[PDB]
Scaffold this active site. Sequence first.
Site, PDB file in Angstrom:
ATOM      1  N   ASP A  29      -0.939  -7.057   1.759  1.00  0.00           N
ATOM      2  CA  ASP A  29       0.306  -6.315   1.788  1.00  0.00           C
ATOM      3  C   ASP A  29       1.841  -5.775   2.223  1.00  0.00           C
ATOM      4  OD1 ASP A  29       0.251  -3.787   2.015  1.00  0.00           O
ATOM      5  OD2 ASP A  29      -0.849  -3.123   4.087  1.00  0.00           O
TER       6      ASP A  29
ATOM      7  N   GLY B 169       1.567   6.286   9.132  1.00  0.00           N
ATOM      8  CA  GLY B 169       3.763   6.508   9.169  1.00  0.00           C
ATOM      9  C   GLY B 169       3.726   5.275   9.340  1.00  0.00           C
TER      10      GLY B 169
ATOM     11  N   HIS C 251       0.726  -1.115   0.149  1.00  0.00           N
ATOM     12  CA  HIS C 251       0.034  -0.196  -0.457  1.00  0.00           C
ATOM     13  C   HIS C 251       1.158   1.253  -0.108  1.00  0.00           C
ATOM     14  CE1 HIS C 251      -0.072   0.554   4.735  1.00  0.00           C
ATOM     15  NE2 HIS C 251      -0.183   2.467   3.888  1.00  0.00           N
TER      16      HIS C 251
ATOM     17  N   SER D 123       3.306   2.276   8.835  1.00  0.00           N
ATOM     18  CA  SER D 123       2.941   1.432   7.766  1.00  0.00           C
ATOM     19  C   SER D 123       4.357   1.064   7.285  1.00  0.00           C
ATOM     20  CB  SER D 123       2.062   2.034   6.198  1.00  0.00           C
ATOM     21  OG  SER D 123       1.094   2.330   6.939  1.00  0.00           O
TER      22      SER D 123
HETATM   23  C1  LIG Z   1      -3.197   2.300   4.480  1.00  0.00           C
HETATM   24  C2  LIG Z   1      -3.917   2.260   6.365  1.00  0.00           C
HETATM   25  N1  LIG Z   1      -4.991   2.405   6.232  1.00  0.00           N
HETATM   26  C3  LIG Z   1      -6.164   2.544   6.894  1.00  0.00           C
HETATM   27  O1  LIG Z   1      -5.070   1.400   8.364  1.00  0.00           O
HETATM   28  C4  LIG Z   1      -7.604   2.739   7.727  1.00  0.00           C
HETATM   29  C5  LIG Z   1      -8.225   1.641   6.331  1.00  0.00           C
HETATM   30  O2  LIG Z   1      -7.732   0.835   5.232  1.00  0.00           O
HETATM   31  N2  LIG Z   1      -7.838   2.640   9.146  1.00  0.00           N
HETATM   32  S1  LIG Z   1      -7.461   4.905   9.147  1.00  0.00           S
HETATM   33  O3  LIG Z   1      -8.271   5.626   8.652  1.00  0.00           O
HETATM   34  O4  LIG Z   1      -8.108   4.692  10.892  1.00  0.00           O
HETATM   35  C6  LIG Z   1      -6.443   4.563   9.512  1.00  0.00           C
HETATM   36  C7  LIG Z   1      -5.725   5.707  10.012  1.00  0.00           C
HETATM   37  C8  LIG Z   1      -5.706   6.041  11.012  1.00  0.00           C
HETATM   38  C9  LIG Z   1      -5.343   7.490  12.543  1.00  0.00           C
HETATM   39  C10 LIG Z   1      -5.361   8.610  11.076  1.00  0.00           C
HETATM   40  C11 LIG Z   1      -4.945   8.879   9.890  1.00  0.00           C
HETATM   41  C12 LIG Z   1      -5.338   6.824   9.136  1.00  0.00           C
HETATM   42  C13 LIG Z   1      -3.029   3.002   7.485  1.00  0.00           C
HETATM   43  O5  LIG Z   1      -2.900   3.944   7.119  1.00  0.00           O
HETATM   44  N3  LIG Z   1      -1.834   2.021   7.494  1.00  0.00           N
HETATM   45  C14 LIG Z   1      -1.043   2.786   8.878  1.00  0.00           C
HETATM   46  C15 LIG Z   1      -1.542   2.429   9.862  1.00  0.00           C
HETATM   47  C16 LIG Z   1      -1.979   0.863  11.159  1.00  0.00           C
HETATM   48  C17 LIG Z   1      -2.794   0.839  12.117  1.00  0.00           C
HETATM   49  C18 LIG Z   1      -3.147   2.074  12.250  1.00  0.00           C
HETATM   50  N4  LIG Z   1      -3.993   1.790  13.755  1.00  0.00           N
HETATM   51  C19 LIG Z   1      -3.920   0.686  15.032  1.00  0.00           C
HETATM   52  N5  LIG Z   1      -2.472   0.247  15.396  1.00  0.00           N
HETATM   53  N6  LIG Z   1      -4.540   0.491  15.303  1.00  0.00           N
HETATM   54  C20 LIG Z   1      -2.861   2.881  11.500  1.00  0.00           C
HETATM   55  C21 LIG Z   1      -2.302   3.233  10.471  1.00  0.00           C
END
Ligand SMILES: C[C@H](NC(=O)[C@@H](CO)NS(=O)(=O)Cc1ccccc1)C(=O)NCc1ccc(NC(=N)N)cc1
Length: 247
Positions: free
Chosen positions: A97, A196, A46, A198
């Site tokens: 991913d 961030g 991703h 990721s």
């Molecule tokens: C691209 C991916 N997207 C998401 O994880 C989306 C669902 O597809 N969820 S989200 O918009 O709630 C992520 C997020 C969280 C906080 C601020 C901005 C975006 C992502 O952002 N990955 C990194 C990521 C991985 C884990 C988390 N959350 C957690 N550890 N609980 C938060 C971010």
Amino acid sequence: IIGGEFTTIENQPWFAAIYRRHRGGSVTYVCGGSLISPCWVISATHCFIDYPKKEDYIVYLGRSRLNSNTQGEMKFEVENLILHKDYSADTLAHHNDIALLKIRSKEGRCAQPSRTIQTISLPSMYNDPQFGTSCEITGFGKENSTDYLYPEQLKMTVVKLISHRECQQPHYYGSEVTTKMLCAADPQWKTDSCQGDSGGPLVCSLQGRMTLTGIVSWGRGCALKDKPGVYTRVSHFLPWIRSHTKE
Ligand SMILES: C[C@H](NC(=O)[C@@H](CO)NS(=O)(=O)Cc1ccccc1)C(=O)NCc1ccc(NC(=N)N)cc1
């Protein structure tokens, strides 16, 4: 990383920082990664799906800070960018991913071992830590969901593995989480990975050995109750990893 502590690259020598070159001249941070061999870094698909141009990327090893240099750091170009062909993103879940980056210095060499640059071991086929086991995550991701900036210093924290059954519960993620994924969180929901982080590593001690058990992939919010971080289950992609790292 929400919560946790600031650390240095000496404590996470396998961590790789991946940046993207821009149309103007500036360079921005994209994702984390892990050095699994002198010439290979593993990350998440991703991170690169929207810009699959390998020439736009820079990989830094031995780097403890986001926007500044660290003594002993090494800069690499991306020779080959391998994305998973079956990658897809649903409402929340990101499937397959996982990505591989073949790196090479300007001199055409792979990474050289040092006190700040080491490889991390891959797991054995279908051999993951028992649920309830403590593991660590590292990254330059957000310290708080409301932040728009990333921390300047590398961070780390400890989270516990959650069973597929518990993570598949209605209040958690339901049927969205699969067996190719691993859930991990803090029992008090105070520390977690965030935007961030990721591509970064979920490292677990498996029989006295540090093992790359997962890759930061997705999650609803950050540090929210009953909403664990979800990681790509590395042990399931070994055949894919081997077939793409040979020749
Ligand atoms: C691209 C991916 N997207 C998401 O994880 C989306 C669902 O597809 N969820 S989200 O918009 O709630 C992520 C997020 C969280 C906080 C601020 C901005 C975006 C992502 O952002 N990955 C990194 C990521 C991985 C884990 C988390 N959350 C957690 N550890 N609980 C938060 C971010």
